[PDB]
Enzyme design. Structure first.
Site, PDB file in Angstrom:
ATOM      1  N   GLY C  10       0.802  -1.210   0.000  1.00 35.95           N
ATOM      2  CA  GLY C  10       0.000   0.000   0.000  1.00 35.95           C
ATOM      3  C   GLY C  10       0.837   1.264   0.000  1.00 35.95           C
ATOM      4  N   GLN C  11       0.172   2.411  -0.089  1.00 34.98           N
ATOM      5  CA  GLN C  11       0.857   3.699  -0.114  1.00 34.98           C
ATOM      6  C   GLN C  11       1.705   3.902   1.135  1.00 34.98           C
ATOM      7  OE1 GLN C  11      -1.155   7.421  -1.484  1.00 34.98           O
ATOM      8  NE2 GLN C  11      -0.729   8.184   0.584  1.00 34.98           N
ATOM      9  N   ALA C  12       1.087   3.726   2.299  1.00 37.48           N
ATOM     10  CA  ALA C  12       1.771   3.919   3.572  1.00 37.48           C
ATOM     11  C   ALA C  12       2.973   2.991   3.701  1.00 37.48           C
ATOM     12  CB  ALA C  12       0.811   3.693   4.724  1.00 37.48           C
ATOM     13  N   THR C 145      -5.814  -1.480   0.336  1.00 36.85           N
ATOM     14  CA  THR C 145      -4.695  -2.347  -0.010  1.00 36.85           C
ATOM     15  C   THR C 145      -3.949  -2.772   1.249  1.00 36.85           C
ATOM     16  OG1 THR C 145      -4.413  -1.224  -2.149  1.00 36.85           O
ATOM     17  CG2 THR C 145      -2.581  -2.585  -1.373  1.00 36.85           C
ATOM     18  N   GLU C 183     -12.051   3.671   7.753  1.00 34.86           N
ATOM     19  CA  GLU C 183     -10.782   3.088   8.175  1.00 34.86           C
ATOM     20  C   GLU C 183     -10.926   2.209   9.423  1.00 34.86           C
ATOM     21  OE1 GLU C 183      -7.980   6.773   6.581  1.00 34.86           O
ATOM     22  OE2 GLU C 183      -7.255   5.477   8.194  1.00 34.86           O
ATOM     23  N   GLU C 254      13.644 -14.356  18.124  1.00 35.53           N
ATOM     24  CA  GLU C 254      13.993 -13.798  19.423  1.00 35.53           C
ATOM     25  C   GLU C 254      13.115 -12.598  19.778  1.00 35.53           C
ATOM     26  OE1 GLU C 254      18.159 -13.119  19.839  1.00 35.53           O
ATOM     27  OE2 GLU C 254      17.989 -12.341  21.885  1.00 35.53           O
TER      28      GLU C 254
HETATM   29  N1  LIG Z   1       2.471   7.382   8.588  1.00 29.10           N
HETATM   30  C1  LIG Z   1       2.002   7.352   7.345  1.00 29.10           C
HETATM   31  N2  LIG Z   1       0.682   7.022   7.113  1.00 29.10           N
HETATM   32  C2  LIG Z   1       0.200   6.990   5.848  1.00 29.10           C
HETATM   33  C3  LIG Z   1       1.026   7.290   4.775  1.00 29.10           C
HETATM   34  N3  LIG Z   1       0.295   7.183   3.645  1.00 29.10           N
HETATM   35  C4  LIG Z   1      -0.964   6.822   3.974  1.00 29.10           C
HETATM   36  N4  LIG Z   1      -1.040   6.707   5.337  1.00 29.10           N
HETATM   37  C5  LIG Z   1      -2.227   6.322   6.120  1.00 29.10           C
HETATM   38  O1  LIG Z   1      -2.813   5.169   5.549  1.00 29.10           O
HETATM   39  C6  LIG Z   1      -4.222   5.214   5.650  1.00 29.10           C
HETATM   40  C7  LIG Z   1      -4.846   4.782   4.326  1.00 29.10           C
HETATM   41  O2  LIG Z   1      -4.082   3.745   3.753  1.00 29.10           O
HETATM   42  P1  LIG Z   1      -3.276   3.944   2.372  1.00 29.10           P
HETATM   43  O3  LIG Z   1      -1.890   3.355   2.463  1.00 29.10           O
HETATM   44  O4  LIG Z   1      -3.209   5.411   2.032  1.00 29.10           O
HETATM   45  O5  LIG Z   1      -4.173   3.207   1.253  1.00 29.10           O
HETATM   46  P2  LIG Z   1      -3.604   1.970   0.393  1.00 29.10           P
HETATM   47  O6  LIG Z   1      -2.771   1.051   1.252  1.00 29.10           O
HETATM   48  O7  LIG Z   1      -2.807   2.484  -0.780  1.00 29.10           O
HETATM   49  O8  LIG Z   1      -4.918   1.183  -0.110  1.00 29.10           O
HETATM   50  P3  LIG Z   1      -5.953   1.816  -1.173  1.00 29.10           P
HETATM   51  O9  LIG Z   1      -7.229   2.216  -0.473  1.00 29.10           O
HETATM   52  O10 LIG Z   1      -6.258   0.755  -2.198  1.00 29.10           O
HETATM   53  O11 LIG Z   1      -5.347   3.015  -1.860  1.00 29.10           O
HETATM   54  C8  LIG Z   1      -4.602   6.637   6.025  1.00 29.10           C
HETATM   55  O12 LIG Z   1      -5.239   6.665   7.280  1.00 29.10           O
HETATM   56  C9  LIG Z   1      -3.298   7.403   6.087  1.00 29.10           C
HETATM   57  O13 LIG Z   1      -3.257   8.244   7.217  1.00 29.10           O
HETATM   58  C10 LIG Z   1       2.354   7.623   4.999  1.00 29.10           C
HETATM   59  O14 LIG Z   1       3.094   7.890   4.055  1.00 29.10           O
HETATM   60  N5  LIG Z   1       2.837   7.653   6.290  1.00 29.10           N
HETATM   61 MG   LIG Z   2      -3.478   3.844  -2.339  1.00 34.20          MG
END
Ligand SMILES: Nc1nc2c(ncn2[C@@H]2O[C@H](COP(=O)(O)OP(=O)(O)OP(=O)(O)O)[C@@H](O)[C@H]2O)c(=O)[nH]1
Ligand SMILES: [Mg+2]
Ligand SMILES: Nc1ncnc2c1ncn2[C@@H]1O[C@H](COP(=O)(O)OP(=O)(O)CP(=O)(O)O)[C@@H](O)[C@H]1O
Ligand SMILES: Nc1nc2c(ncn2[C@@H]2O[C@H](COP(=O)(O)OP(=O)(O)O)[C@@H](O)[C@H]2O)c(=O)[nH]1
Ligand SMILES: [Ca+2]
Ligand SMILES: [Mg+2]
Lengths: 54, 427, 437, 334
Positions: C10-12, C145, C183, C254
């Site tokens: 995923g993006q995060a 994701t 979420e 561990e």
């Molecule tokens: N700490 C941190 N949190 C993030 C970041 N990007 C997204 N998030 C968090 O991730 C949550 C949403 O998940 P995402 O990763 O953006 O979505 P995804 O995993 O790409 O899944 P999709 O819905 O298909 O796009 C939100 O609540 C954001 O606050 C990041 O770069 N750093």
């Molecule tokens: Mg995404």
């Protein structure tokens, strides 16, 4: 108080200090869950196209 | 993610043309179809609405539909009239005579296949089509009757795509004919079933705003359309420029639609401005936040204090303290928490874009899914029942093959929609 | 030497992965092109850093990592990023359309048409290993994701790699940076499905990170870049023992042994200190006693909660910089008499300590100031269950009205999975209660 | 415009607080399950502290200290006092007590029971009141729950005329900064019937609860002597004041009990803040030596003192955090 397992190296060192002593699903099942949900999507889409056909 | 635009009928094409005029300026596109901007923010997601041709020519992914060539000829001679792909001009000759039946069952059914061939030709070019957006009125015959017919047939061929609409509601204050409540009720019935997102643009509100607020003694359709194009540009900002919040049609629907039938949104905008009259004073963030939430700024003639917000999507535009935005947005919810349902935590979502619209240093667009929208549908239902109880003006429709039962059904389903909105107002 | 593969979902997960591997490269002296001048065994080896990096005959050191996202925009910035030469195409997997903040769409619908590809691309890394320990999975709770596809992946890995350990780095959802209203749904759903498949999971509430950036780095409106570069420092502190010579947490097994006595309760609380602004004109370097004392301040935790009103099961102290055992023992002695630290009766009251002499590295141009000594405390406290309570409450509010449920059912999911997932969480809150009070 | 919620309807004290707040025209009451609040007048059981201080843009406050039950529960208070080094094995101001579980430290209790019997000194205890250990242990096992056995003060100070028994109730307020505020107006919940030294069966002159007593209303109105009268009585009947002979001991015991648990409940650097009203119950012997009986985490006030106290809470505990557009407390410094 009691330090133990003191290990040392060039990078650093580790140890433990004690202050006081004490007192899966198979590939089959997975593919069955995913395909079953796929049928539920197919049924839902079929009912739509049936409704639209009317 | 490409979006296929469609505009049906007189109203739909006139706001649709104005829409492409406005955002084309925002994306630095000229009537020739050439880019002449200074920022790269303009071209990052320009593929959402524009098809790119050789020589870096940007052509709107738009389809212009009408059962008469009158309005569409005006578009083609209009300011940006030349930008549109000429093959996407699909039109008849008979017109619909403000008859929903003609647009949906007889006159329009004869033309709909020609439209879907254009829709199919565009969709095949898309790398990843996310959905469609329609612009039309519900008071006429073509945009209302044929528009909902297109939507139904688009869903049949693209059932896994999002359907969005900018639906202009009729009002006695701005009325062409007496049969508008009929055409509207019949159309709402279609929209409840075959759309994921509908921006309710009440002509009553657009008039009252022009009269009461903007102090326009006699507002024209042009004055009304200044507000529409402003709103249309705002609610699509997050789609047209790089962002995290509601960047596509689906994610917007997931965040805005807690229940599938309840997807009729109240658009709002601030600062309210009339054509030509340039404002010299930029509004502070507290002023933008206060105004965009005030009933006097809603594009749908509904009192938001008579209902509760299920979900809200706000988008501030311009150069401002995003901290101050976060504060003011949190202040509204904390001061008026009663007007936000407690059983949907954090239902308000805010976004910010650096590029402001033309003429304004900064602005704020509001998108609310309030239960108070029922006041709109109840209003249509009363005007509908007033005529239908005497079966008045019904011969225009039965002459096209329609039965009285189909009206009774459309009436019942909209009254159901009202009661459903009422259900979550007292939850 | 045993290898470790890092999966970024995923993006995060991807963007945090970029922050971590960026930091790893600077800690090991690996350049953006992958060249590591200090490594004298060309073309291979079995050093401690090789746990995270393989080697080509050309002398390039590539991360043992796979990036997956159902939407290309994020990973595309890796393909064209400053570390584009570091990875190779087969490590970067991208779909067409995302899961649209929908768990069911990421797990069932879109998750089904790419799960076989990802596992194959993972198998290609596993084949290059002489002794695979297991996996480190980075993802969000909120995303479709991060939540949906991760749970599906974690299920298949347990089938294809039954003997291998699997650790999580999870981003707990926060409204201040939330992208979706549902979420909480996605969080409960992915937790329930992943629970039996996760050995140890480090949760990071964006709320906590967000306020730390505002409070200690003086950033008014923290971007993901601000959050991630801070998170990477925490992750680095945890994985340093796998990448450097030592005798504490030298392998994945561990981590579970030291921090996770009870399997289901495998969510250790992380606390980091000190966090100092780079723009801070004058700074007084903090001592071992001061930074160690900061590990018991809720304002420094990755999740805001109150350990005082709970019980500890384990507690690790990972130091980086000028630190020696003598100062640590003195600090622990002082703090013990001042603060409330209650362990469970069936656990010894003590601290496993680890020290690396190399102080924490900082990204050039970053927001963090170089420090002479830092510390990350890993404590398995029942107080972290407050996060589950917060999350389940929001879940109950929306689900009581069945709000947004149709989006999930529309993807083939059953409404029963909602209640089944929530029931598992209710049991989890009870497990924390039995141990905690 | 601040906002607050109410989740304890039975609270006579905070029912008045909620009334005062609304009367300022700067506070708005929300629904029970509205998370967007500034203040929370929570419940007595299962108060969700874990859901506090997680609302962006809101400074949240609650009228309860998490973990303060360790002081407000009899079984916990004994443990706290016996384990805490600050209170130690035998602080002079707390009666000798033991924790007893139904069929622990039962063997330890009997060891002290022998010294009293093999010393021919006072050997009366309380859970019922008796001088036989066998009569007590049989009572605890018959009830079901955990009870505390405690040394009974056999030589209590007795008010004249009447030769009566009494207990003092002091109201203490701890704000968010943990400033310990003692309410200047306390009350003596007196017994109306003369204290009987021999017959312990009659618990009407031994137990000085306001409910048991309700000779009710003979000497003073409603078996409640305030400090102005009690002080005047001490001066006339014993040639001393209330401040000197008793209040210094009270202020000491209060200051000691709360300092002991400060690091365990303080909300100094927390994401949410706490305040709380306590009701300490003391006991005076014939030698003017005060004894702590217990602490109440959810105390009720006296009808006369409701207005003054409930207003007092708003000023220092609420309005201090949430300011609006000489004092009745005594700050126990530390
Ligand atoms: N700490 C941190 N949190 C993030 C970041 N990007 C997204 N998030 C968090 O991730 C949550 C949403 O998940 P995402 O990763 O953006 O979505 P995804 O995993 O790409 O899944 P999709 O819905 O298909 O796009 C939100 O609540 C954001 O606050 C990041 O770069 N750093
Ligand atoms: Mg995404
Ligand atoms: N150790 C002791 N020695 C002498 N008298 C005692 C005593 N313990 C209790 N009492 C008497 O018994 C009365 C009630 O006991 P307690 O106060 O322990 O019950 P409670 O907790 O139900 C009252 P509240 O509602 O005020 O908290 C006291 O006011 C006091 O008069
Ligand atoms: N805002 C706006 N509304 C319009 C315009 N033209 C027509 N309408 C509305 O649409 C209804 C008439 O429908 P119309 O568009 O003429 O029907 P069609 O052309 O056959 O599809 C009336 O209720 C009008 O209020 C316009 O230019 N602007
Ligand atoms: Ca090597
Ligand atoms: Mg017309």
């Amino acid at each position: 108080m009691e330090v133990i397992e003191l290990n040392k190296c060039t990078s650093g060192q580790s140890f433990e200090v004690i202050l006081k002593p004490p007192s899966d699903p198979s590939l089959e099942e997975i593919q069955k869950k995913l395909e079953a949900a796929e049928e539920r999507r197919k049924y839902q889409e079929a009912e739509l196209l049936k409704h639209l056909a009317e | 993610r490409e979006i296929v635009h469609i505009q049906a009928g007189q109203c739909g094409n006139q706001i649709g043309a104005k829409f492409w005029e406005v955002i084309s300026d925002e994306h630095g596109i000229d009537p020739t179809g050439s880019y002449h901007g200074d920022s790269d923010l303009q071209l990052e997601r320009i593929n959402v609405y524009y098809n790119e041709a050789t020589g870096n020519k940007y052509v709107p992914r738009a389809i212009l539909v009408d059962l008469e060539p009158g309005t569409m000829d005006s578009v083609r001679s209009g300011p940006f009239g030349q930008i549109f792909r000429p093959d996407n001009f699909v039109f008849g000759q008979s017109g619909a005579g403000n008859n929903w039946a003609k647009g949906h069952y007889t006159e329009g059914a004869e033309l709909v296949d020609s439209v879907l061939d254009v829709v199919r030709k565009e969709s095949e070019s898309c790398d990843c089509l996310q959905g469609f957006q329609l612009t039309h009125s519900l008071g006429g015959g073509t945009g209302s009757g044929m528009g909902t017919l297109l939507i139904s047939k688009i869903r049949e061929e693209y059932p896994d795509r999002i359907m969005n609409t900018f639906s202009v509601m009729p009002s006695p204050k701005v009325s062409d004919t007496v049969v508008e409540p009929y055409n509207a009720t019949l159309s709402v019935h279609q929209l409840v079933e075959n759309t994921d997102e509908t921006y309710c643009i009440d002509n009553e509100a657009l008039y009252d705003i022009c009269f009461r607020t903007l102090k326009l003694t006699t507002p024209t359709y042009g004055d009304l359309n200044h507000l529409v194009s402003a709103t249309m540009s705002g609610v699509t900002t997050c789609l047209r420029f790089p962002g995290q919040l509601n960047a596509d049609l689906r994610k917007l629907a997931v965040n805005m639609v807690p229940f599938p039938r309840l997807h009729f949104f109240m658009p709002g905008f601030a600062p309210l401005t009339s054509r030509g009259s340039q404002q010299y004073r930029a509004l502070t963030v507290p002023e933008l936040t206060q105004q965009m939430f005030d009933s006097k700024n809603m594009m749908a003639a509904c009192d938001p204090r008579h209902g509760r917000y299920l979900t809200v999507a706000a988008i501030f535009r311009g150069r401002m303290s995003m901290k101050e935005v976060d504060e003011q947005m949190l202040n509204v919810q904390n001061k008026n928490s009663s007007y936000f349902v407690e059983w949907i935590p954090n239902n308000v979502k805010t976004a910010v874009c650096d590029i402001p619209p033309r003429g304004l240093k900064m602005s704020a667009t509001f998108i609310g899914n309030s239960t108070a929208i029922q006041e709109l549908f109840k209003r249509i239902s009363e005007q509908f029942t007033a005529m239908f109880r005497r079966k008045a003006f019904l011969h225009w429709y039965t002459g096209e093959g329609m039965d009285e039962m189909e009206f009774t059904e459309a009436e019942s389903n909209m009254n159901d929609l009202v009661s459903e909105y009422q259900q979550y107002q007292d939850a | 030497m045993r290898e470790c593969i890092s999966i970024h979902v995923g993006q995060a997960g991807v963007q945090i992965g970029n922050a971590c591997w960026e930091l790893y490269c600077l800690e090991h002296g690996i350049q953006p092109d992958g060249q590591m001048p200090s490594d004298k065994t060309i073309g291979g080896g079995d050093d401690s850093f090789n746990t995270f990096f393989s080697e080509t005959g050309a002398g390039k050191h590539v991360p043992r990592a796979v990036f997956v996202d159902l939407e290309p925009t994020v990973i595309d910035e890796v393909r064209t990023g400053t570390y584009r030469q570091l990875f190779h195409p087969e490590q970067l997997i991208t779909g067409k359309e995302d899961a649209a903040n929908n768990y069911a769409r990421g797990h069932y619908t879109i998750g089904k048409e790419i799960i076989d590809l990802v596992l194959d691309r993972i198998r290609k890394l596993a084949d290059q290993c002489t002794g695979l320990q297991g996996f480190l999975v980075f993802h969000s709770f909120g995303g479709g994701t991060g939540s949906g596809f991760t749970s599906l992946l974690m299920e298949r890995l347990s089938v294809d790699y039954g003997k291998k350990s699997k650790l999580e780095f999870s981003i707990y959802p926060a409204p201040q940076v939330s992208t979706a209203v549902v979420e909480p749904y996605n969080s409960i759903l992915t937790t329930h499905t992943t629970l039996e498949h996760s050995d140890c999971a480090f949760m990071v509430d964006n709320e906590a990170i967000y306020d730390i950036c505002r409070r200690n780095l003086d950033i008014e409106r923290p971007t993901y870049t601000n959050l991630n570069r801070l998170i990477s420092q925490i992750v680095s502190s945890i994985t340093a023992s796998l990448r450097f010579d030592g005798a504490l947490n030298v392998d994945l097994t561990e981590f579970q042994t030291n921090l996770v006595p009870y399997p289901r309760i495998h969510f250790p609380l992380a606390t980091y200190a000190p966090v100092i602004s780079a723009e801070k004109a004058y700074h007084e370097q903090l001592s071992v006693a001061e930074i160690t004392n900061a590990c018991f301040e809720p304002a420094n935790q990755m999740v805001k909660c109150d350990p005082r009103h709970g019980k500890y099961m384990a507690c690790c102290l990972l130091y980086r910089g000028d630190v020696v055992p003598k100062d640590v023992n003195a600090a622990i002695a002082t703090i013990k008499t001042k603060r409330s630290i209650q362990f469970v009766d069936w656990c010894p009251t003590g601290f496993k300590v680890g020290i690396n002499y190399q102080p924490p590295t900082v990204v050039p141009g970053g927001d963090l100031a170089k420090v002479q000594r830092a510390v990350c405390m890993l404590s398995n406290t029942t107080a972290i269950a407050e996060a589950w309570a917060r999350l389940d409450h929001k879940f109950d509010l929306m689900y009581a009205k069945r709000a947004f449920v149709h989006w999930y059912v529309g993807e083939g999911m059953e409404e029963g999975e909602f209640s089944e997932a929530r029931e598992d969480m209710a049991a989890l809150e009870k497990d924390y209660e039995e141990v905690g009070v | 415009m601040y906002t607050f919620v109410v989740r304890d309807e039975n609270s006579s004290v905070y029912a008045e607080v909620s009334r005062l707040l609304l009367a300022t025209g700067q506070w708005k009451r929300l629904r029970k399950d509205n998370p967007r609040f500034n203040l929370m007048l929570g419940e007595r059981n299962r108060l969700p502290f874990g859901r506090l201080g997680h609302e962006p843009g809101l400074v949240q406050l609650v009228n309860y200290y998490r973990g303060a039950d360790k002081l407000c529960r009899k079984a916990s208070l004994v443990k706290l006092i016996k384990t805490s080094p600050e209170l130690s094995e035998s602080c002079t101001w707390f009666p000798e007590s033991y924790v007893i579980y139904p069929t622990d430290e039962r063997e330890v209790f009997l060891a002290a029971y022998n010294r009293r019997r093999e010393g021919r000194e006072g050997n009366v205890w309380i859970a019922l009141i008796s001088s036989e250990a066998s009569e007590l242990l049989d009572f605890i096992d018959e009830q079901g729950q955990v009870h505390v056995i405690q040394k009974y003060l056999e030589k209590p100070l007795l008010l004249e005329p009447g030769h009566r028994k009494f207990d003092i109730r002091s109201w203490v307020l701890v704000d968010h900064l943990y400033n310990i505020y003692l309410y200047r107006e306390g009350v003596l919940r007196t017994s109306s019937e003369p204290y009987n030294s021999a017959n312990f069966q009659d618990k009407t002159c031994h137990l000085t609860n306001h409910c048991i007593q309700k000779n009710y209303g003979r000497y003073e109105e409603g078996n409640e002597m305030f400090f102005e009268e009690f002080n005047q009585y001490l001066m006339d009947a014993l040639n001393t004041t209330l401040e000197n002979s008793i209040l210094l001991q009270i202020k000491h015991i209060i200051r000691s009990c709360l300092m002991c648990i400060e690091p365990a409940i303080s909300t100094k650097h927390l994401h949410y803040q706490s305040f709380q009203l306590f009701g300490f119950d003391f006991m005076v012997d014939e030698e003017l030596k005060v004894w702590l009986i217990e602490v109440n985490g959810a105390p009720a006030c006296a009808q006369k003192l409701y207005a003054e106290l409930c207003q007092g809470i708003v000023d220092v505990a609420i309005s201090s955090v949430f300011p609006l557009a000489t004092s009745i407390f005594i700050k126990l410094h530390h």
